[PDB]
Symmetry: D2
Subunit: 326 residues, 4 copies
């Protein structure tokens, strides 16, 4: 009975605001619905395949990457609530024209889970929202803030159902898209992650490159020293999907640094920070294995960061291993 718009408006009225966050989120929701509709019939629309370009990270851009990126950029611009936009698919930050300029800075991953698009596995959209602090003209530097400065973050999950997970200062709430009326309805309030889970999520195909800590941790999940039941393994392959499951089922999700990648694979501004924020607001933890993800001060809008997140007791157990090896 409660839409995302209604929820955000009331929450914003309690925080004494102008209403552009509601404007920003309402706009973001429109793009998310458009992306969801395209995704649900991508094959019919011939939306699978490459776009013929590579982004800064080196990823081969896909058709849905371009569509989603264009949709998000346009709705945020027209929202009159943003001034600086950072996207995985754009080399440099996008500065909104003076006329439609707002007070928020948005970092987003238009379409997360690239490798899972063609096999119809869950994909999504990730976003992190900051308030412009500076007084000078808007620039890329405005997006180089540590995650702990986020005022809102979340993601749209295009899975069996489309879910918009939104985290703000007071907590995390899940809204499900009702395809019939095109509205996101609140379905899970003040979500909190279990203190300890029973699922570990990591691509073990990188075993040869894992550091001693990750290696020891995985071995521990498979062969509990206390004869407890081994953890079950789950790795969908799309960060949004694995992280969402971690949030609602508990457990741990890992994309750590490895011999070949000092800073892991996932991008700090639009993948790691948003999810770290959602996790901490849900009572979970998010670390690189040596420091809290949200405390990292970025120097590159496309910089990568190792990330280990989920239930506090699980993340802590891994942190102790990193400490032990240090």
């Amino acid at each position: 009975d409660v839409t995302l718009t209604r929820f955000v408006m009331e929450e914003g009225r309690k925080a004494r605001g102008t209403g552009e966050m509601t404007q920003l989120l309402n706009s973001l929701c429109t793009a998310v619905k458009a992306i969801s509709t395209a995704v649900r019939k991508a094959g019919i629309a011939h939306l699978y395949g490459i776009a013929g370009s590579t982004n800064v990270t080196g990823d081969q851009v896909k058709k849905l990457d371009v569509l989603s990126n264009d949709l998000v950029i346009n709705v945020l611009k027209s929202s009159f609530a943003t001034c600086v936009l950072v996207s995985e698919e754009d080399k440099n930050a996008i500065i909104v024209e003076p006329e439609k300029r707002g007070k928020y800075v948005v970092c987003f991953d238009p379409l997360d889970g690239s490798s899972n698009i063609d096999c119809l596995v869950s994909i999504g959209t990730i976003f992190g929202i900051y308030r412009k602090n500076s007084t000078d003209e808007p620039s890329e530097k405005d997006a180089l803030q540590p995650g702990r400065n986020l005022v809102a973050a979340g993601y749209a999950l295009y899975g069996s159902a489309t879910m918009l997970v939104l985290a703000m200062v007071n907590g995390v709430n899940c809204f499900m898209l009702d395809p019939a009326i095109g509205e996101f309805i609140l379905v899970d309030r003040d979500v909190k992650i279990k203190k300890k889970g029973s699922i570990y999520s990591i691509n073990e195909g990188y075993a040869k490159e894992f550091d001693p800590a990750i290696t020891e941790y995985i071995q521990r999940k498979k062969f509990p020293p206390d004869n407890s039941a081994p953890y079950g393994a789950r790795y969908v392959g799309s960060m949004v999907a694995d992280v969402h499951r971690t949030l609602v089922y508990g457990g741990i999700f890992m994309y750590p640094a490895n011999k070949k990648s000092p800073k892991g694979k996932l991008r700090l501004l639009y993948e790691c920070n948003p999810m770290a924020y959602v996790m901490e607001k849900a009572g979970g933890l998010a670390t690189t294995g040596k420091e809290a993800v949200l405390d990292i001060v970025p120097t590159d809008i496309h910089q990568r960061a190792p990330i280990i997140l989920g239930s506090p007791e699980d993340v802590t157990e891994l942190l102790e291993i990193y400490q032990k090896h240090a």
Copy 2:
């Protein structure tokens, strides 16, 4: 431009038939669309949660399990094309009333991927269709046929998009549900799996219970003896999703027997056989590690069977390991 109905009708006209297979599939498609619609808004409809019962396999029945089961049973009965139905959610085979009795026997998994329902990860519906051979009245024995006797098999995948994958004697074809008109449109014709993939899919949380062959194979995927790139790992957790990815991306999917489960976990009649059939029609292989899944003569409608399937070169590599250890 080609619907599943049109495809099946023409293919059936070439095989000189009465048309009940088209009737059966048309009916199945209606249930699949109903399940898809419910799944896409399950949270809004309060469809997440347990049903308050356990099936023969011992699974805790979920709300979507009951809904999907009822929908499939009703449409198949009214199809006038079936005589015996076997469902994961029903203790004994369902014998269709004389009046609406057809010539086909259908084994199905109304909702596959139970553990993934609540976290919105891909789930689906699996089916295997047989032609009644006996001349006597229809009974459970009519469903106890080896998979190689299947005349049609496939699955509906409720992922980022809803796909109906259908395999018949001539090959495998993928049809995507167009939400706007409620029709499955052909999007992938005569699908063939790659001879060798680069993804292995298995729940490694069972490492402590794996046999020496599975153990050696996994280690080989992580540390290629020829210094080739290690395989990537993917395990969505829903058989339909992992198998579909295996079909379109290549690679291998495994749910082998282990120290605790002599016959693995997956069910032969409505999970293993249908997927084994799809795989073989796509040029892939499906084995228990010691024998072809489709050649097993079942004695229990709910019996389990180990299953290793996917690209022929990958499955063969594992088979050689089993042989080596034998």
Copy 3:
């Protein structure tokens, strides 16, 4: 709980048939759903406007006319149940290719209510189905049968909701399109028109050209000689809409001959006959004012015919006036 497919299949099984009528109707339903979806968002799709051509009747062809015509022609051809097609938008009858040739002849109005398209008023699709009687090759003559030879007829109404009204030998049934699953669900069984209504439907803008009978009848509806309540007037402007209301509310619908049009405006094969058939199966009447519409033997596939239809007592009252003036 009962789909149109299920209804037609069972009704056909009682009539001992091959099943192509079910095939024909299933195919027609697919086109109807496609037309409905396009219509519901025609403005967004830029589907309003002229096509740049005029048909035999002299109507200015519209974009939706072409789209609907193409959809209906293609699905009927691929149905494998038709041999001759007659459309308002095609100069000559369309002979189905030998390979996909069936036993039925279909006369249809792909999009009825042309003048109401742009103002978003109800429009629809009308069809009449005949069984080929001849033994020789299929030709236009096969469509020149009197309406009383119809085996099925009806219409799709794209109004506040999309309804498929189907009339066959046993009666008239209404099925509503469920947008969520793309299936027509039975909502009104064995529909029967009221013996006498209280609504008269006619374009009175033609008053100057009406014959004495129509003139006297209208005056009688406005000034009842028995001081009864005057009839209410309703004229949506789309035959499908006015006729549907006549069916479910009772009353009379008129598009009579006039000084300028000896045979009225509406077309016999794809407008008048189908509606006359629906009406008679519902216990209503359909006359030109001098003879039953269904008994007219056509000589032109695009010939026009005056038509007065609806509740038997109302139509009879008008018939007596025509008789009185004769």
Copy 4:
């Protein structure tokens, strides 16, 4: 490419506002989408039939009347933009609770075209928005303002497609609901009615009770004194549908006073004023036959008013007749 939200926000930013009008309209749009979805499948949902009550006007309340009323009342309350609500289905004005109280007063007809619901003919929702002028606590008197005080007005038309027609100080714009993404998209900008049309819309079943002016006018439309082509007649029966057609095709719509009804049938606050406002903003006229509808100062929230509206030359022609008879 432009949504109603985007349009209203920009238009409001030009008028220097707080943004609650955008909030109000966004909220209204949500209710309209919910009503549209229910209407499009009303038969399936068993939404046809009476509710078991009668409103102040004496109308037999229908199921869709209650549903639509509840939806509109709830979204407007939660909008935080209204203080007083007037509905056809509510005996007295509804005063919004202090906490969610806004500055606007809204008069609405939750579901217009009652008699057309069951025959699936076009129906809709009509609304008129005023700014609270008083300084004292909100009361029914706040809704008793002349229509010329309206700041916004329009209607949702649930016809072949769902259209939201919005009129504000700068003009009239049409937005069509895209069922796929649940967003109203601008499809007709700055709509202007033709100076003179060729369609007259009135229920001639009331001929016995019409005044001499209406009687002479109709006769003139049928028998032009200058031998011009007679006007065509159209009377859908739902004010929203007939008025919309009048807007986009031109012509005249009439529901005048008659011997039995001194003030006609239509209600001033939620039917006549909104449509009169839309008409005048489109360059049309709206009169009772003796005075402009928008200048009437209401004394009863449910008072009726005669209404004649449409193309200026047509309305003027009728006005001259009223003058001539006066």
